[PDB]
Amino acid sequence: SALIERIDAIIVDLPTIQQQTLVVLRVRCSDGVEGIGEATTIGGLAYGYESPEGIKANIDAHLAPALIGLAADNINAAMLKLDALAKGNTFAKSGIESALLDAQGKRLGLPVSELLGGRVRDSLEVAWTLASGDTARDIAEARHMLEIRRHRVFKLKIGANPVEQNLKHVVTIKRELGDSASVRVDVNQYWDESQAIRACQVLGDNGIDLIEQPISRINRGGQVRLNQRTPAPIMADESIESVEDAFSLAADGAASIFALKIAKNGGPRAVLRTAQIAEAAGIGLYGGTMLEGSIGTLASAHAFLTLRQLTWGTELFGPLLLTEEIVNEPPQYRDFQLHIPRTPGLGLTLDEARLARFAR
C-alpha cells in the first residue's frame, strides 16, 4: 500500500572533536511515514570509491528515480532493483535501505532490529580508536575511558609510520594497560606482506588481540598466509567490499574475523547476509563503522543486535566523535556499551534546525 514518494539525499558537514561529512537520506512515503538513513564515508574517496558528492549525485540521478512509485514496504524488491540498475554503490544503497527500514519500522511500530528478525541483546560492546598519535596521550585517554566505564577495548590506527615506531607505540600502550583493556590494531592496508610478517608476530607476542586489515586487499594470498601464520588473528575489513567478497574470503580462509560494515555491504540486510556467511564458515564477527552518526550507527546496531555472537564486539563509536548531531536522540553510551532502545524504526528523529544548519 504505502509507496515511496520522494527521496532526499542531503550532504551534511558536522563538527567533530575537524569536520565529518554524512549524506542524510529522507525517504517520504505516501502513507505520511518518513524514514531516515545515512551514507557516510571517511575522507572523500580515500576509504572507498564512494564520496559524499558521488553518493548524492547517483542517488539523485539514478537510485532514487528508480524507486519512486514503488511499494515502500517491499524493501527486498526495491533493493534488488537497485542491484539490477547499479553496480556497487553500497554506501548509497546502504543509506537508502537504512531509510526504508526506518520508515517501515515506524509504520509497523517495530524497531528495525525486530524487522530484521529480532534482537538477542539490547546493547553492544563498543571499542574506541585512540587517535592522538601520542603514546602517553593515548594511554591517558585509555585510562580515562576505562575510568568513566565508556570503553575497555581500544584500537590503534597504524601503518602510517615506520613499522618499528608503530610497533613500539602499540606494544608500549598494551604493556602499560595490561589485562585491563583489549588492544587491537587497524593497519588499513598500509603494510605489504613483507612488512606484516614481522609486525604481526611482534604484536601477537605482546598481547595484541587481533590485527585488522594488515595488508592490502590486492594481496589475497598474503591474507591467506597471514591468516595461517599470525600469532594474532587476522580480521578482514577493506577486503570486503561486498557480500560476494565475504564469500570469496571465507572460501579462501583469508581471515578468521570479518568486520561488519553496512556501508561496505549495502545496508543492514546486506551486512547480515555477510554475517550469515561468516557464521556458516565459522568466521568471527565484529561490528564495524565508517564513523557514521547516530543514524548510520543505529542502523548498524539494529542489525548487530540480531547476531548470535560478535566475538570481538563493535566499534560503533561514530557519534561520540561529533560535537553536533542532526537527530534529537543522543546515543546511549554506558558501561562499555551502546544501548539500543526498543522504539520503532531506528528510534531517531531529525533535528530539523541543525539539519538546516549543517547541511552544506
Residues 288-327 that bind a copy of itself (CB under 8 A): 306, 308-309, 311-312
315 included as an active-site residue: yes
Residue list 56-85, contact with a copy of itself (CB under 8 A): 56-58, 60-63, 71, 73-78, 80, 83, 85
243 binds a copy of itself (CB under 8 A): yes
Q: How many CB atoms lie within 10 A of CB 360?
A: 11
**What b/e readout covers 135-173, taking b as 16+ CB neighbours within 10 angstroms?**
beebbebbeebbeeebbbbbbbbbbeeebeebbebbbeb
The closest of 191, 214, 286 to 246, measured between CA atoms, is: 286
- 324 labeled binding residue: no
Residue list 169-188, contact with Mn ion (CB under 5 A): 186
Q: 135 vs 201, which CB is nearer to a copy of itself?
A: 201
Residues 10 and 199: their CA atoms lie apart, in Å, by 42
Q: Of the listed 81, 157, 176, 241, which one is catalytic?
A: 157
Residue 156: strand, helix, or coil = strand
198 binds, among Mn ion, a copy of itself, none (CB under 5 to 8 A by kind): a copy of itself
Residue list 142-201, contact with a copy of itself (CB under 8 A): 164, 179, 192-195, 197-198, 201
Q: Taking the complex as a whole, how short is the minimal distance between the CB of residue 155 and Mn ion, in angstroms?
A: 8
Please report the beta strands in the chain, taking only residues with DSSP state E, as ranges in sequence order: 4-15, 19-29, 34-40, 123-125, 128-130, 153-157, 182-186, 211-212, 234-236, 257-260, 284-287, 332-333, 337-339
Q: 113 vs 219, which CB is nearer to Mn ion?
A: 219
157 included as an active-site residue: yes
89 binds a copy of itself (CB under 8 A): yes
Residue list 191-230, contact with Mn ion (CB under 5 A): 212
Residues 70 and 133: their CA atoms lie apart, in Å, by 49
Amino acid at 62: H
- 245 labeled binding residue: no
Pick out the residues of the known binding site.
186, 212, 237-238
Pick out the residues of the known binding site for Mn(2+).
186, 212, 237-238
Q: Which residues are catalytic?
A: 157, 315
